[PDB]
Each structure stands twice: as C-alpha cells, then as structure tokens.
Amino acid sequence: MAAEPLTELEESIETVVTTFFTFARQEGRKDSLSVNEFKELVTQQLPHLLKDVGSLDEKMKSLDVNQDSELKFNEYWRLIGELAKEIRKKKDLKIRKK
C-alpha cells in the first residue's frame, strides 16, 4: 500500500498519489481521499485546471456513487479522468490554442 517511482509514465500517476495521500490518510481509509480536503485542494493546488472551483457539486455527486462518507479511488476516479481531459480542452469552443 505504498506508491514508489519507477518509469516517467508510471511516476506521473505515482506523483498524484504520493503528494496528496500524506494528508488524505488523516481521515478514514488510507487509499480514500477526504470529502472536505479534496474541495480545498481543487481551490488551492489545482485551481487553473478545473475552471469551476466553486461549482464542484456536479462532479461531487457523480464521484460518490455509493454514498458512504469519503471518496475512495474507485469513486474519486470520475475527477481523475476530468483532470487530464480539462487540461487541454476545458473550453473547446471559445479558447483552442494553449
């Protein structure tokens, strides 16, 4: 249950786990991310990527599909895809040259 660096492509997915899981372990489950801390991370360390830092209720409901307490990686996975999808095409209509 510990992410170690190996190759350039394997290190990218490892950097996202090793950087925020140090604070996510504070609440229940080691592999699960907190419901109150992920909202603060998207408005402090990840604000430029996801334009809707305040309007996160659309994804917040889609993430916790089982509805327990926190966002497990299987539940948080809905934002992991939007992380690399909104990086190049957050507004593919007005701005298309980054």
Contacts with ligand ANW by CB under 6 A lie at 1-3, 17-18, 21-22, 25, 30-31, 88
DSSP label at 47?
T
The one of a second copy, ligand ANW, none whose footprint includes residue 22, by CB under 5 to 8 A per kind, is ligand ANW
Residue 55 or 77 with smaller CB distance to a second copy:
77
> Is 96 among the residues that bind a second copy (CB under 8 A)?
yes
As a whole number of angstroms, the distance between CA 88 and CA 98 comes to 7
The one of a second copy, ligand ANW, none whose footprint includes residue 46, by CB under 5 to 8 A per kind, is a second copy
Residue 68 CA from chain centroid, whole number: 18
Extract the tokens encoding 43: 């408005």
